[PDB]
Amino acid sequence: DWVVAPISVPENGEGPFPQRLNQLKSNKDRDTKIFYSITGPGADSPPEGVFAVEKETGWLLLNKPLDREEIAKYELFGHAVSENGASVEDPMNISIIVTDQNDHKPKFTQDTFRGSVLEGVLPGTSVMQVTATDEDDAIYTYNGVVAYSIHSQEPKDPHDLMFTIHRSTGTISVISSGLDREKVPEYTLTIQATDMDGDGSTTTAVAVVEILD
Amino acid sequence: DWVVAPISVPENGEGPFPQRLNQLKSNKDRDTKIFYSITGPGADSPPEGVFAVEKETGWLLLNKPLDREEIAKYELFGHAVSENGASVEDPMNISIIVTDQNDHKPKFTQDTFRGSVLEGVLPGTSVMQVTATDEDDAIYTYNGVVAYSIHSQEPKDPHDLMFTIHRSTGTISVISSGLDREKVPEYTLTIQATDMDGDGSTTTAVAVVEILD
Numbered sequence A, B: 001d002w003v004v005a006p007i008s009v010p011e012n013g014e015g016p017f018p019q020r021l022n023q024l025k026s027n028k029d030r031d032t033k034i035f036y037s038i039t040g041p042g043a044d045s046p047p048e049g050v051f052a053v054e055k056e057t058g059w060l061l062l063n064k065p066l067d068r069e070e071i072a073k074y075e076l077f078g079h080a081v082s083e084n085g086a087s088v089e090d091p092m093n094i095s096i097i098v099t100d101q102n103d104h105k106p107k108f109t110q111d112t113f114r115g116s117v118l119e120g121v122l123p124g125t126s127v128m129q130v131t132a133t134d135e136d137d138a139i140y141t142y143n144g145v146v147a148y149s150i151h152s153q154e155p156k157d158p159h160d161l162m163f164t165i166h167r168s169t170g171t172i173s174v175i176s177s178g179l180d181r182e183k184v185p186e187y188t189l190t191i192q193a194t195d196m197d198g199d200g201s202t203t204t205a206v207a208v209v210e211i212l213d
């Protein structure tokens, strides 16, 4: 049977609301006044009244901005009832697919990570791994894709930047010589993660590296 | 049965084209690859290729601006064929209703109308009727509704304006005393018609009034 195709609605819409999405119609409206209604989560059960249908035009409406990170898909049913009170169609499946926008900034899993490394490991040696998440989508867009970086080091001894970070994995490595527990037992690195793989909004944290004897 | 509701498309659209209108879908696409096509005037017969359907997505498309005054409605059919070459649905009726914009200026039925009136008819006496048409719609909007007016009179004897016009009917009447064949045997009135019932674009003509002895 011919059905309504899933309907794609970008999240965080600006309206105006209510917003027309699709017009339901039974062709038995040749003969009878028909009353359209809708059921399902989003309509008559939680969250109620996100969608509605105009009972005489059949126009399915969306009444407010959506948010993919709360609900990504809605499964509704459309119904058609004669003026006399008989349902004149099997309920129609309607699907609403909510599409991603970049409405979330990245968030580090901790404000402060802690790792350690031996003085005198060769340059290129992995030290620790840091991690940030993004609620948005990483499969079809870069809204959820994170770019790791290092904003600065303290102290700047012996060199101004002694560590680097893998922009995808967040592994921090040593890139310099001169680590020396006795001279400088600890470094504090301000670390940053940016969504859109670098083009987006940024968040910040720190990583503390103990220099092992 | 649940069908596609007639689809309203304002004429003279600015695109971009091709433009998505509606997404056809057979639910037998669970089991089989389905190929969508469309027939009817506007699709596979004249004017051909105004509409099209993407054979695998089912997306009905409009490929160029429409014009209500050439074609106000299109009746198409949608079809669904399995990869194996069987049609798996009765063809679906699709209707496209083209909605009016004010794309036509008014046009007088003649460049020059001719009428006559006796000197010394009382003020208020009907003289002649002029007529303009507008292709646009007069039922739901004022795009086709015309406002008649008089831009000027020649000669300006004895008074500057001796005639008036019914802003709806275009009947010209005498509003002054002093008509006199011997003094002034003829007047030439520049007449105007404006759509949007006065707020629109204007066209111009003349009416020649013979003054009868």
Ligand SMILES: [Ca+2]
Binding pocket: A102, A103, A104, A105, A106, A134, A135, A136, A143, A144, A145, A195, A196
């Ligand atoms: Ca994001």
Ligand SMILES: [Ca+2]
Binding pocket: A011, A068, A069, A100, A101, A102, A103, A104, A135, A136, A137, A143
């Ligand atoms: Ca998002």
Ligand SMILES: [Ca+2]
Binding pocket: B102, B103, B104, B105, B106, B134, B135, B136, B143, B144, B145, B195, B196
């Ligand atoms: Ca017009």
Ligand SMILES: [Ca+2]
Binding pocket: B011, B068, B069, B100, B101, B102, B103, B104, B135, B136, B137, B143
């Ligand atoms: Ca028009």
